[PDB]
Amino acid sequence: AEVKLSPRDREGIINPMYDCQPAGAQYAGIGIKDCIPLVHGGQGCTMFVRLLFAQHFKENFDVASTSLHEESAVFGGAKRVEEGVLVLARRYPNLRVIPIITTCSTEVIGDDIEGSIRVCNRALEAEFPDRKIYLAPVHTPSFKGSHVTGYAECVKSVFKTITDAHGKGQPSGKLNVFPGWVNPGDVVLLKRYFKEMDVEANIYMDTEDFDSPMLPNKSIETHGRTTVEDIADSANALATLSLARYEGNTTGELLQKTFAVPNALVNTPYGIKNTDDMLRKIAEVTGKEIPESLVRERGIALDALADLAHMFFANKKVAIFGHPDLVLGLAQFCMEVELEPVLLLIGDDQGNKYKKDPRIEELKNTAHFDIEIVHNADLWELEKRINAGLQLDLIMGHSKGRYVAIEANIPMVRVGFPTFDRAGLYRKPSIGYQGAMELGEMIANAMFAHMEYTRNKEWILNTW
Amino acid sequence: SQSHLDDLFAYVEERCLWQFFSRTWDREENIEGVLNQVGRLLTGQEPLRGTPQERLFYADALAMANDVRERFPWASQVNKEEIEFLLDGLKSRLVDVTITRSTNRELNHHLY
Amino acid sequence: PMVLLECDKDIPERQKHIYLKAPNEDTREFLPIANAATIPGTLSERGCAFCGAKLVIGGVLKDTIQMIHGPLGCAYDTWHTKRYPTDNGHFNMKYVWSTDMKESHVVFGGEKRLEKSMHEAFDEMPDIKRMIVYTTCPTALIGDDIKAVAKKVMKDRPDVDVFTVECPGFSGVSQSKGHHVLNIGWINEKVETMEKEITSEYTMNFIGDFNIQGDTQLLQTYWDRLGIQVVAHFTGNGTYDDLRCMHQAQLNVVNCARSSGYIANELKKRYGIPRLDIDSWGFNYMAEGIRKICAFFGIEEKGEELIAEEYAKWKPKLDWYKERLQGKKMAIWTGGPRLWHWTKSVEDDLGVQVVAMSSKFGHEEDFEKVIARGKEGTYYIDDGNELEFFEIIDLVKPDVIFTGPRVGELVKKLHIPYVNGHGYHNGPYMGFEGFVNLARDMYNAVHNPLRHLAAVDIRDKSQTTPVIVRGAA
Ligand code: CLF
Ligand SMILES: [Mg+2]
Ligand SMILES: [Mg+2]
Known part of the structure; x- marks a missing residue:
């Protein structure tokens, strides 16, 4: 009967849900081909984030530091930016894009990033006359927002930089697609959907090849596939499809204001209805029919979920944490399969935006159970509520919440970022029809294993 | 002989850590303290095991003395004076390479 | 000899950092420079001084709150990354604490935000009575005096003991500086208490x-x-x-x-x-x-x-x-x-x-x-x-x-x-x-x-x- 938004009631954080803005800016940048982000700050701001990406993906990604040291903290760090850009350019001959990402240190000391970019542009034009390197200023102070906001800021700044340089050309006939912060498997699903619907689209950023092969020829293919050319062509698109309000919609709006490319923000496609509505929007903007192949994939997903919903899911209580577009989308998916998402945790200071999200209203009008949405949440909020008596049958969230579930003896499905404590999840779609099916089956299989380990009617797994 | 000294020096360099302490004064103390006990042990003299520092120089020295006797047949053949002479040359060489000509810029920092 | 790698032709200072040991050399003439400034933009493996204090040394302890005074990234980044079990259920690996520094704290100071976070941490886990507080880049830059806050907390809460470490990530050149600051403070303040x-x-x-x-x-x-x-x-x-x-x-x-x-x-x-x-x-x-x-x-x-x-x-x-x-x-x-x-x-x-x-x-x-x-x-x-x-x-x-x-x-x-x-x-x-x-x-x-x-x-x-x-x- 009531969906209530409330903030965390503590000033401090125990067990943060998200990383800081610069980490999200790094994630945006590593999806660009021939890009090495340069993180202007102390060394930990780079190295810890490279480790985080290795935890999620089990791969290396290249990011550099400006190595701020004590002298720059007293006199300013511009010379560290300028050196860092040239040392990148000189040692990586194919490098084309450097997002220059600020940190808490370099925001506090007020280094003039745009001034350093003018110096480096002059230096690079003189030293490498036949090269163009795009330097994008990315302002990501860590004392506001989160890696979610930092992702969105970097995407927007890179797009502004590159489209500023190339402007509007000939119509491409393509869609721009900003899926937000999703896995390689989600990108693979979207590419299939557009191919089956005969819709040309660029997916920003294209992270499919983050899951790179170990090849006979020892080649390294672990790269973003989105090129300068692909980003520049965004000016020429027929439309933008933005799937994530907090993860790239603001770039869709920028391209609408600058280049009159109409932006369509839709619910993030977690679950069946949200996928349906995404495909209807694609059909509306392109004039292309939804193919039979997607009716069939949808029907296969529904068939699978129907084996689970009333038998194993109905009336089971769920807590969900992760990025806001993921939390809100998964809550809607859960209700489609008769799960009851009673506790939604969103991890940053953007509550004044979340209060206006139309999906809150979609929950307030649908749910038959109270939902608490805690914004500015940490993961201690979850643990403390369980310790105070909250009864949960399932947790859905990323791997940094694992000990909460382990100790409480609650089954947990790993979703969102980072999912380092299970194998291969970055390759499994979560969005779309196949993604809904895969999520539902992870939920059931986690419950099934729990029933066996706890001897809770484990004999029932025979004739369902 | 120079060969015997070269044997002792190559052993200490590849095996021991006490010559590589954090400051000049500690390297000097250890080179003197350990190698004086080595001399005692290799010449059948009563080791000094009074103070905690003495006991520790004995412990380091015992490993080296046992290893030198096991590795180098000459160390059981040369006389007391010859052992002493070699160990004096070894102190000089260890001070030369770990202190006098070390470019380790922390060695004379007054504070730890 | 010292080695100029092909990939370092434009950063040739790197030659004094790379030694290839060759027969008959006097190795005293070929000791790499070490513990010097990092070159920006190199993809050096180095981390920061805060890492050397909290992740490496202090965070190993099984019964101590690790209060990281700064924005939440420094805390997030040092959690779920180490493998130092305990015999009390791995308290050290399960939790990390942040003062969640916001823009208002950069403007007005973060000392009251730290103090409040400290009391919250002790209130949330009443069995834990020990804490280490660490500075990070921006709390060092704004001059919050975490030793004075810790002193007030221990006066106000006589059953706790708190230690503090000043180790913003720009201090020194690497994790090494954090080791030093922690070691010397501990022997100065807490040994023989x-x-x-x-x-x-x-x-x-x-x-x-x-x-x-x-x-x-x-x-x-x-x-x-x-x-x-x-x-x-x-x-x-x-x-x-x-x-x-x-x-x-x-x-x-x-x-x-x-x-x-x-x-x-x-x-x-x-x-x-x-x-x-x-x-x-x-x-x-x-x-x-x-x-x-x-x-x-x-x-x-x-x-x-x-x-x-x-x-x-x-x-x-x-x-x-x-x-x-x-x-x-x-x-x-x-x-x-x-x-x-x-x-x-x-x-x-x-x-x-x-x-x-x-x-x-x-x-x-x-x-x-x-x-x-x-x-x-x-x-x-x-x-x-x-x-x-x-x-x-x-x-x-x-x-x-x-x-x-x-x-x-x-x-x-x-x-x-x-x-x-x-x-x-x-x-x-x-x-x-x-x-x-x-x-x-x-x-x-x-x-x-x-x-x-x-x-x-x-x-x-x-x-x-x-x-x-x-x-x-
Ligand atoms: S070098 Fe080290 S890890 Fe970096 S900030 Fe500095 S103490 Fe910390 Fe912190 S919140 Fe994020 S990760 Fe940085 S931008 Fe600031
Ligand atoms: Mg079926
Ligand atoms: Mg040798």
């Missing part, structure tokens, strides 16, 4: 061991067998209050001389406790260390009984691995000390030839040690970077690399296997059993069917797919 019961004639501290995969708990089986009381472990499987008792020990045994030599040196200066450096990795090294400890205490026969049993249990397996690992080439790209603890121990005990080594943050002291113990024809790199790693692989062609997981995932593409040189694969790796565990992981890494499979191009009609025969000790 309580005492414990002495239950043995033989007492020691074990200084510079962080319980990676249970290393400290494995070594503790030796001290219990020998009847030695360990007053404090700095800091593996440790407690805040045990560290306040360090002055009581008769002997300080040091393994990590880089991170923790500082406090051993000050304990000797101030309390007369001798510093004994050992190697607690390496099979024959562990025997030497036990014999020195036992010679210091006058319990030599107890030491020889322990060594004999451990060799009877483990040496046959060690020698099985040596037969199969002899002549394999290894690289070690870690922080610094494991270079000099491992180069000669894998050579002696496993027949492995270490052909390239890189230290993130070692000092000239660490290079003295590793060059003294290391081979001719080996590369010794201070503050190595990613392009240098590729050029070095092309020069020395290692069969295995001991390094962190991200680099391990990079060199996998070149079909080179890795062992996690930091957090281990299947540890512990200290002690007699531990070196057998290290050898097993090395063996399974290199003699791995997947490596052979990856090299086959199925399109080549001249190629078949091989089968390899493995073994087990």
Whole structure:
């Protein structure tokens, strides 16, 4: 009967849900081909984030530091930016894009990033006359927002930089697609959907090849596939499809204001209805029919979920944490399969935006159970509520919440970022029809294993 | 002989850590303290095991003395004076390479 | 000689950081620069000073709140990244704390935000009464006086004890600075602020061991067998209050001389406790260390009984691995000390030839040690970077690399296997059993069917797919 938004009631954080803005800016940048982000700050701001990406993906990604040291903290760090850009350019001959990402240190000391970019542009034009390197200023102070906001800021700044340089050309006939912060498997699903619907689209950023092969020829293919050319062509698109309000919609709006490319923000496609509505929007903007192949994939997903919903899911209580577009989308998916998402945790200071999200209203009008949405949440909020008596049958969230579930003896499905404590999840779609099916089956299989380990009617797994 | 000294020096360099302490004064103390006990042990003299520092120089020295006797047949053949002479040359060489000509810029920092 | 790599032609200052050991050289003329400023934009492996204080040393403790005064990233980034178990359910790995610094705190100060966070942390976990507070980049820059806040909290809450560390990430050049600041503050402020019961004639501290995969708990089986009381472990499987008792020990045994030599040196200066450096990795090294400890205490026969049993249990397996690992080439790209603890121990005990080594943050002291113990024809790199790693692989062609997981995932593409040189694969790796565990992981890494499979191009009609025969000790 009531969906209530409330903030965390503590000033401090125990067990943060998200990383800081610069980490999200790094994630945006590593999806660009021939890009090495340069993180202007102390060394930990780079190295810890490279480790985080290795935890999620089990791969290396290249990011550099400006190595701020004590002298720059007293006199300013511009010379560290300028050196860092040239040392990148000189040692990586194919490098084309450097997002220059600020940190808490370099925001506090007020280094003039745009001034350093003018110096480096002059230096690079003189030293490498036949090269163009795009330097994008990315302002990501860590004392506001989160890696979610930092992702969105970097995407927007890179797009502004590159489209500023190339402007509007000939119509491409393509869609721009900003899926937000999703896995390689989600990108693979979207590419299939557009191919089956005969819709040309660029997916920003294209992270499919983050899951790179170990090849006979020892080649390294672990790269973003989105090129300068692909980003520049965004000016020429027929439309933008933005799937994530907090993860790239603001770039869709920028391209609408600058280049009159109409932006369509839709619910993030977690679950069946949200996928349906995404495909209807694609059909509306392109004039292309939804193919039979997607009716069939949808029907296969529904068939699978129907084996689970009333038998194993109905009336089971769920807590969900992760990025806001993921939390809100998964809550809607859960209700489609008769799960009851009673506790939604969103991890940053953007509550004044979340209060206006139309999906809150979609929950307030649908749910038959109270939902608490805690914004500015940490993961201690979850643990403390369980310790105070909250009864949960399932947790859905990323791997940094694992000990909460382990100790409480609650089954947990790993979703969102980072999912380092299970194998291969970055390759499994979560969005779309196949993604809904895969999520539902992870939920059931986690419950099934729990029933066996706890001897809770484990004999029932025979004739369902 | 120079060969015997070269044997002792190559052993200490590849095996021991006490010559590589954090400051000049500690390297000097250890080179003197350990190698004086080595001399005692290799010449059948009563080791000094009074103070905690003495006991520790004995412990380091015992490993080296046992290893030198096991590795180098000459160390059981040369006389007391010859052992002493070699160990004096070894102190000089260890001070030369770990202190006098070390470019380790922390060695004379007054504070730890 | 010193080496100018092709990838460093435009950063030629790197030549004084890279030594290739050649016959007959006076190594005093070729000591890498170390512990100097990083070059921006290189993809250096270095971390920050805050990491060296909280992640490496302080965060190991099993009963202490780790309050990171700063924005939430520094906290997020040092959580779910270490493998230092405890015997109390891994409290240290389950939790991290942040003051969640916001823009208003940059403007107006963060001292009241810290104070409030501290009391919240003690209120949320009423069984925990110890805390370390760390500064980070922006709380250092705005001048919050965390020692004065801690003083007020301890006045207001007399059942807690709080320690503070100033270690913003821009301090020093690397993690090394954090070690130093923490070590000296601890001995200045907290040693000899309580005492414990002495239950043995033989007492020691074990200084510079962080319980990676249970290393400290494995070594503790030796001290219990020998009847030695360990007053404090700095800091593996440790407690805040045990560290306040360090002055009581008769002997300080040091393994990590880089991170923790500082406090051993000050304990000797101030309390007369001798510093004994050992190697607690390496099979024959562990025997030497036990014999020195036992010679210091006058319990030599107890030491020889322990060594004999451990060799009877483990040496046959060690020698099985040596037969199969002899002549394999290894690289070690870690922080610094494991270079000099491992180069000669894998050579002696496993027949492995270490052909390239890189230290993130070692000092000239660490290079003295590793060059003294290391081979001719080996590369010794201070503050190595990613392009240098590729050029070095092309020069020395290692069969295995001991390094962190991200680099391990990079060199996998070149079909080179890795062992996690930091957090281990299947540890512990200290002690007699531990070196057998290290050898097993090395063996399974290199003699791995997947490596052979990856090299086959199925399109080549001249190629078949091989089968390899493995073994087990
Ligand atoms: S070098 Fe080290 S990890 Fe970096 S900030 Fe500095 S103490 Fe910390 Fe912190 S919140 Fe994020 S991760 Fe940085 S931008 Fe600031
Ligand atoms: Mg069916
Ligand atoms: Mg030698």
